[PDB]
């Protein structure tokens with residue numbers, strides 16, 4: 001690299017929320033209405049390199065070898081303003097990012113993408129940010145990214161402001177190494193659909209939102225106690241119920257909506273069939289119809305074959321859970 005050039009590259013993995021973040025207390029700083037709990041996936045990640053050069057005039061984002069629109073470009077420049085203030089400089093950056101995430105198949109990349117960017121910036125500019133402050137930095141880009149700083153189980157503490165809303169890793173005595181996630185890629189509209197926008201309509205207008213709020217802390221505690229005991233059935237039951245309550249809130253919105261299609265329901269049925277056949281597993285869904293199946297690694301294949309009787313082989317994608325957090329790479 002050049003004399004005055006400062007560069008950094010980071011790999012960050014996606015994470016799936018087991019206890020859902022859904023609805024914000026603060027739209028600008030991205031403060032959530034409740035705590036969330038997630039696991040970081042071994043298979044899916046983003047690699048983001050940033051290069052700061054004084055001669056650079058504006059920020060440039062190249063994604064999988066391709067320039068982004070003026071919209072996406074404006075958004076990354078605003079985010080990088082946060083980085084510039086934090087660093088106390090006015091350097092603009094060239095950002096080259098590659099997503100190793102099945103985005104076409106509906107998996108979200110925002111969590112790994114902002115986690116990777118945050119970590120890459122910290123490496124480039126030598127900011128020496130703590131994991132806590134890295135999480136806060138990522139959170140500004142996308143709420144779920146706060147958790148992707150960490151491996152295994154992680155929890156996003158909601159806080160009440162920019163300083164206090166961030167995530168931390170949860171030690172589970174290695175339990176994360178025993179678990180897996182199976183992704184069922186569900187046929188879906190290709191029309192525009194937005195997570196940030198949906199949770200906002202629900203938070204603001206949903207007749208069942210208080211019902212969500214009233215139960216989330218109880219759920220969260222039950223899940224964490226479950227993790228402390230490496231009690232899979234216990235974790236699974238509560239996260240499955242939580243996930244469903246999250247979707248119930250959308251049904252109460254003004255006017256109502258859903259992210260689930262009949263095929264999602266079909267896959268949910270296969271999950272319950274598996275339980276009844278002595279193959280423990282539990283499902284959760286995000287802002288789309290894809291069904292994610294939490295399963296013990298020992299049962300991964302057996303559960304997958306149950307799905308493979310109904311669904312195309314291409315639509316059944318498993319991932320392990322990674323133990324380590326964001327990493328600095330070449």
Ligand SMILES: O=C(O)[C@@H]1CCCN1C(=O)COP(=O)(O)OP(=O)(O)O
Pocket residue numbers: 016017019020021022030036110111141142143144145195196285286287
């Ligand atoms: O992952 C999550 O924790 C929740 C739970 C269910 C799905 N989901 C989401 O889609 C959250 O998507 P985000 O990109 O983090 O929304 P923003 O904070 O506006 O950037």
